């Protein structure tokens, strides 16, 4: 079809960015063994969460 | 995505489609060598003045 920009594969990368997204905020869950490692995993369970730990 | 989506428009609007356009050159590339042929014939077509009680 075009030579000149294989939008399929524009595609499939941009696809893969997103699978490797979420493959390093699962990791990092993993590794360090908490699930909200920074506030945007949870404002309210981090909130909730320093208030237990105080 | 935004991205992408306007690359796959813009795509359409400029990049060649190869296949499409490799029936246009084609078609063309042929008629070339039939015009060049239907031109090598047309200057002999004067010859028969030669043979005319000359």
Partial sequence: M?????????????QLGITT???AK???????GYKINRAADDAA???????MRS | NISENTSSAESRI???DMAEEMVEYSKNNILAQAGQSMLAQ?????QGVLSLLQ
């Fill in chain 1, 2 to 14: 075009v030579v000149q920009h294989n939008l399929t594969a524009m595609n499939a990368n941009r």
């Fill in chain 1, 21 to 23: 997204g979420a493959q």
């Fill in chain 1, 26 to 32: 699962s990791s990092e869950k993993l590794s360090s």
């Fill in chain 1, 45 to 51: 369970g981090l909130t909730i969460s320093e208030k």
């Fill in chain 2, 14 to 16: 400029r990049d060649t």
């Fill in chain 2, 42 to 46: 047309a200057n002999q077509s004067t």
